[PDB]
Enzyme design. Structure first.
Site, PDB file in Angstrom:
ATOM      1  N   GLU A 140       3.069  -1.473   6.032  1.00 16.34           N
ATOM      2  CA  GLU A 140       4.255  -0.597   4.458  1.00 16.34           C
ATOM      3  C   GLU A 140       3.238  -0.309   3.353  1.00 16.34           C
ATOM      4  OE1 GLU A 140       6.902  -4.002   3.449  1.00 16.34           O
ATOM      5  OE2 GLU A 140       7.832  -4.486   5.108  1.00 16.34           O
ATOM      6  N   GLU A 239       8.911  -8.269  12.004  1.00 18.65           N
ATOM      7  CA  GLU A 239       9.553  -9.689  11.129  1.00 18.65           C
ATOM      8  C   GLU A 239      10.434  -9.180  11.732  1.00 18.65           C
ATOM      9  OE1 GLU A 239       8.074  -9.042   7.232  1.00 18.65           O
ATOM     10  OE2 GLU A 239       5.603  -8.902   7.250  1.00 18.65           O
TER      11      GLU A 239
HETATM   12  O1  LIG Z   1      -1.846  -0.955   2.495  1.00 20.00           O
HETATM   13  C1  LIG Z   1      -0.123  -1.575   1.627  1.00 20.00           C
HETATM   14  C2  LIG Z   1      -0.425  -3.002   0.491  1.00 20.00           C
HETATM   15  O2  LIG Z   1      -1.067  -3.464   1.201  1.00 20.00           O
HETATM   16  C3  LIG Z   1      -0.996  -4.541   0.010  1.00 20.00           C
HETATM   17  O3  LIG Z   1      -1.716  -5.542   0.996  1.00 20.00           O
HETATM   18  C4  LIG Z   1      -0.833  -6.474   1.880  1.00 20.00           C
HETATM   19  C5  LIG Z   1      -0.160  -7.437   1.329  1.00 20.00           C
HETATM   20  O4  LIG Z   1       0.654  -6.780   0.876  1.00 20.00           O
HETATM   21  C6  LIG Z   1       0.495  -7.571   3.119  1.00 20.00           C
HETATM   22  O5  LIG Z   1       0.989  -9.045   2.389  1.00 20.00           O
HETATM   23  C7  LIG Z   1       1.929 -10.164   3.372  1.00 20.00           C
HETATM   24  C8  LIG Z   1       3.810  -9.752   3.373  1.00 20.00           C
HETATM   25  O6  LIG Z   1       3.958  -8.133   3.569  1.00 20.00           O
HETATM   26  C9  LIG Z   1       4.703 -10.781   3.904  1.00 20.00           C
HETATM   27  N1  LIG Z   1       5.800 -10.638   3.408  1.00 20.00           N
HETATM   28  C10 LIG Z   1       6.943 -10.683   4.088  1.00 20.00           C
HETATM   29  C11 LIG Z   1       7.556 -11.086   3.480  1.00 20.00           C
HETATM   30  C12 LIG Z   1       9.254 -11.349   3.982  1.00 20.00           C
HETATM   31  O7  LIG Z   1      10.017 -10.388   3.310  1.00 20.00           O
HETATM   32  C13 LIG Z   1      11.195 -10.469   3.132  1.00 20.00           C
HETATM   33  C14 LIG Z   1      11.565  -9.729   2.108  1.00 20.00           C
HETATM   34  C15 LIG Z   1      12.349  -8.444   3.109  1.00 20.00           C
HETATM   35  C16 LIG Z   1      13.375  -7.743   2.580  1.00 20.00           C
HETATM   36  C17 LIG Z   1      13.425  -6.910   1.393  1.00 20.00           C
HETATM   37  C18 LIG Z   1      13.155  -8.550   0.693  1.00 20.00           C
HETATM   38  C19 LIG Z   1      12.386  -9.188   0.847  1.00 20.00           C
HETATM   39  N2  LIG Z   1       7.244 -11.326   2.626  1.00 20.00           N
HETATM   40  N3  LIG Z   1       5.583 -10.884   1.804  1.00 20.00           N
HETATM   41  O8  LIG Z   1       4.407 -11.740   4.350  1.00 20.00           O
HETATM   42  C20 LIG Z   1       2.588 -11.908   5.131  1.00 20.00           C
HETATM   43  C21 LIG Z   1       1.972 -13.564   5.338  1.00 20.00           C
HETATM   44  O9  LIG Z   1       3.060 -14.606   4.138  1.00 20.00           O
HETATM   45  C22 LIG Z   1       1.623 -11.342   3.698  1.00 20.00           C
HETATM   46  O10 LIG Z   1       0.369 -11.138   3.974  1.00 20.00           O
HETATM   47  O11 LIG Z   1      -1.020  -8.621   3.833  1.00 20.00           O
HETATM   48  C23 LIG Z   1      -1.111  -7.281   4.237  1.00 20.00           C
HETATM   49  C24 LIG Z   1      -1.928  -7.252   5.263  1.00 20.00           C
HETATM   50  O12 LIG Z   1      -2.848  -8.012   5.145  1.00 20.00           O
HETATM   51  C25 LIG Z   1      -1.830  -6.491   3.024  1.00 20.00           C
HETATM   52  O13 LIG Z   1      -2.553  -5.263   3.443  1.00 20.00           O
HETATM   53  C26 LIG Z   1      -2.082  -4.106  -1.028  1.00 20.00           C
HETATM   54  O14 LIG Z   1      -2.009  -5.448  -1.682  1.00 20.00           O
HETATM   55  C27 LIG Z   1      -1.744  -3.580  -1.684  1.00 20.00           C
HETATM   56  O15 LIG Z   1      -2.638  -2.596  -2.837  1.00 20.00           O
HETATM   57  C28 LIG Z   1      -1.658  -2.300  -0.859  1.00 20.00           C
HETATM   58  O16 LIG Z   1      -0.530  -1.398  -1.807  1.00 20.00           O
END
Ligand SMILES: OC[C@H]1O[C@@H](O[C@@H]2[C@@H](O)[C@H](O[C@@H]3[C@@H](O)[C@H](n4cc(COCc5ccccc5)nn4)O[C@H](CO)[C@H]3O)O[C@H](CO)[C@H]2O)[C@H](O)[C@@H](O)[C@@H]1O
Ligand SMILES: OC[C@H]1O[C@@H](O[C@@H]2[C@@H](O)[C@H](O[C@@H]3[C@@H](O)[C@H](O)O[C@H](CO)[C@H]3O)O[C@H](CO)[C@H]2O)[C@H](O)[C@@H](O)[C@@H]1O
Length: 434
Positions: A140, A239
Site C-alpha cells: 500500500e 488481506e
Molecule cells: O511503504 C509504505 C509505508 O510503509 C510503512 O511500513 C509498512 C507498515 O505500515 C505495514 O504495517 C502492516 C499493516 O499495514 C497491517 N495492517 C492491517 C490492518 C487492517 O486494516 C483494516 C482496515 C482496512 C481498511 C480500512 C480500515 C481498516 N491494519 N494494519 O498490519 C501488519 C501487521 O499487524 C503491519 O505490519 O507493514 C509493512 C511491511 O512490514 C511496512 O512496509 C512505513 O512505515 C511508511 O513509512 C511507508 O510510507
C-alpha cells in the site's frame, strides 16, 4: 525435510505445486506480533522464536491454513526451526521485504541503497526455504490519488529484487505487490504493476468490501472479479476480514473458493491470527503467554474446511506488452520511466572520497532546506511524476546530505565543514589521493 511443501511456481496467472502440477490456492492468515533505547527491533519476529511459532502452529493447523502472511522478519536471526515446523504442517509463507522503519516512504518516495540492502538481507535470510511462497516488494505504498508518484519506485524495487534473486544461487522466488482498495486508484494501480517492461509476479489486494452476511453481488466481489478476469499474473486477497459485524462469519470464504471466483482469484489470507486491541484476531495471547481462542476462530475454521476450490492443472493450462496508464493531474501521476538500480559501489565511493560527511546515529528537513538553498540539489532529487531521477538519488539519505555539504568546495581548504552539528565530521580519507 520439506517433503510436505513442494515449491510453488507460477505459470501464467495461476500458482502450481511444482511436483503434483495441481493448482495452488492460498488458504491463509496473517501472522505478525506487535509491541504495545535501541537494543531490540521495533517489529517482533515470531518465526525467529521457536517458543512462539511452535505454540501457534497447532492452532494454525486447526484453522486449516496452508499459508501465512508475515510482514516483518529480522534477517540477522535464524528461521530454519519455524520454517521447517511450518513445512511439516504443509504451510507456506508470503513475506514482505520491507519493515516499518525501512520502507519506500509514500510521503517522500526514494528507491535507494538503504532500502535495497534491507530487501537483499531478507532475500538472503529466507530464500533457502521451499515453503517461501513469495515476497512483497511493497504494501500500500500508493494508497490514494495524492501519492501515485510513489509507484515507479515500487516497480523499480520489484525489478531489482527479481534481478537480485535471478543473479543469486537461490530458487527464483516470485516478487509481487500488495495494494489497498481505494476506488479512484485501484484500476490504474493494477494496470501499472503489469505494464511496460517491468511486472509484478503476483498481485495481492487488501480486500475488506465484504462485511457481515453479505453476498457475491452486493459486496462488490462480482465487480472486482469481472475487473480482474484475464489479468496476466496471479491475483488474490493479501488481506480479508471486515470486522464491522462480529463474530465475523467469514462467509466471503464461500464466495472466494466458489466456482465463479476460483477461476479468477488464487485465494486469500484472513487478517489476522493475533488479537491486538483491534478486533481483528482469531486468538488472544493471555498474561500467561497461552493461546485463548476467540469467537471468530470457529467460523474461519468451518469456512476454510468447507472451501474446496476446483482448479486446473499445469499441463491443461499450458495448452504485446500492456500499456501503462496515461498521466492525468490529480488522478494518476506515475511515470512509466523508473529510477535506476541503486548502486552500492557508487554510493560507497561517497563514503570514501567526500571531504564532509554526516553520521546517521527533523534534522534532515532543516539541513536539506538549508544546504539546497546554497548548492544545487538536483543530483539527489527523484521525481516519479516526471520520471527525472538525479545521479545520486539512489544513495542513502546521509550520503545525499554529505554530498551537498561537501559541495565546502567556499574553498577554504581548512577542514572546517560548513554545518554546525555534532554528526558532521571532516573525512580524513578524502585527503588520501572511483
Ligand atoms: O511503504 C509504505 C509505508 O510503509 C510503512 O511500513 C509498512 C507498515 O505500515 C505495514 O504495517 C502492516 C499493516 O499495514 C497491517 N495492517 C492491517 C490492518 C487492517 O486494516 C483494516 C482496515 C482496512 C481498511 C480500512 C480500515 C481498516 N491494519 N494494519 O498490519 C501488519 C501487521 O499487524 C503491519 O505490519 O507493514 C509493512 C511491511 O512490514 C511496512 O512496509 C512505513 O512505515 C511508511 O513509512 C511507508 O510510507
Ligand atoms: O474509500 C477509501 C478506502 O477504500 C476502502 O475500500 C472500500 C471498501 O471499504 C468498501 O466496502 C463497503 C463496505 O464497507 C460496506 O459495508 O458494504 C459496501 C457494499 O455494500 C462496500 O462497498 O467498498 C469500496 C468500493 O468497492 C472500497 O473502495 C479501502 O479498503 C481503503 O484502503 C481506502 O482507504
Amino acid at each position: 525435510s520439506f517433503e510436505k511443501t513442494p515449491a510453488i511456481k507460477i505459470v501464467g496467472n495461476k500458482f502450481f505445486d511444482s511436483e503434483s502440477g495441481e493448482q495452488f490456492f492460498i488458504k491463509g492468515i496473517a501472522y505478525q506480533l506487535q509491541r504495545s533505547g535501541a537494543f531490540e527491533t521495533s517489529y517482533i519476529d515470531a518465526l525467529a522464536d521457536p517458543k512462539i511459532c511452535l505454540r501457534d502452529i497447532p492452532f494454525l493447523k486447526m484453522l486449516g491454513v496452508n499459508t501465512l502472511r508475515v510482514y516483518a522478519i529480522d534477517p540477522t536471526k535464524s528461521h530454519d526451526i519455524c520454517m521447517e515446523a511450518l513445512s511439516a504442517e504443509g504451510m507456506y509463507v508470503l513475506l514482505d521485504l520491507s519493515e516499518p522503519d525501512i520502507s519506500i516512504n509514500r510521503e517522500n518516495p526514494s528507491w535507494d541503497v538503504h532500502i535495497f540492502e534491507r530487501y537483499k538481507s531478507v532475500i538472503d535470510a529466507m530464500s533457502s526455504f521451499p515453503n517461501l511462497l513469495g515476497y512483497f516488494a511493497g504494501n500500500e505504498v500508493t494508497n490514494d490519488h495524492t501519492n501515485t508518484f510513489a509507484s515507479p519506485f515500487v516497480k523499480a524495487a520489484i525489478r531489482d529484487a527479481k534481478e537480485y534473486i535471478s543473479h543469486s544461487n537461490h530458487r527464483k522466488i516470485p516478487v509481487g505487490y500488495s495494494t489497498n482498495d481505494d476506488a479512484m486508484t485501484r484500476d490504474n494501480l493494477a494496470r501499472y504493476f503489469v505494464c511496460g517492461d517491468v511486472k509484478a509476479d503476483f498481485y495481492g489486494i487488501n480486500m475488506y468490501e465484504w462485511c457481515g452476511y453479505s453476498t457475491y453481488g452486493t459486496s462488490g466481489y462480482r465487480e472486482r472479479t469481472k475487473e480482474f478476469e484475464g489479468y496476466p499474473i496471479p491475483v488474490f486477497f493479501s488481506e480479508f476480514g471486515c470486522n464491522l459485524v462480529r463474530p465475523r462469519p467469514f462467509t466471503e470464504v464461500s464466495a472466494l473458493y466458489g466456482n465463479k471466483m476460483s477461476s479468477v482469484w488464487s485465494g486469500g489470507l484472513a487478517y489476522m491470527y493475533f488479537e491486538e486491541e483491534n478486533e481483528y484476531g482469531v486468538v488472544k495471547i493471555n498474561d500467561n503467554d497461552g493461546v485463548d481462542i476467540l469467537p471468530d476462530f470457529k467460523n474461519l475454521k468451518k469456512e476454510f474446511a468447507k472451501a474446496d476450490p476446483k482448479g486446473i492443472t499445469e499441463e491443461e493450462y499450458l495448452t504485446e506488452s500492456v500499456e501503462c496508464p496515461h498521466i492525468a493531474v490529480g488522478v494518476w501521476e506515475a511515470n512509466e520511466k523508473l529510477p535506476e538500480t541503486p548502486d552500492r559501489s557508487k554510493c560507497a565511493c561517497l563514503d570514501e572520497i567526500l571531504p564532509c560527511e554526516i553520521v546517521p546515529f527533523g534534522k534532515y528537513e532543516e539541513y536539506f532546506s538549508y544546504l539546497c538553498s546554497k548548492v544545487d540539489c538536483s543530483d539527489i532529487l527523484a521525481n516519479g511524476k516526471t520520471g527525472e531521477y538525479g545521479e545520486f538519488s539512489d544513495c542513502s539519505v546521509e550520503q545525499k546530505l554529505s554530498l551537498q555539504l561537501s559541495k565546502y568546495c567556499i574553498g577554504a581548504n581548512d577542514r572546517h565543514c560548513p554545518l554546525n552539528d555534532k554528526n558532521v565530521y571532516f573525512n580524513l580519507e578524502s585527503l588520501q589521493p572511483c
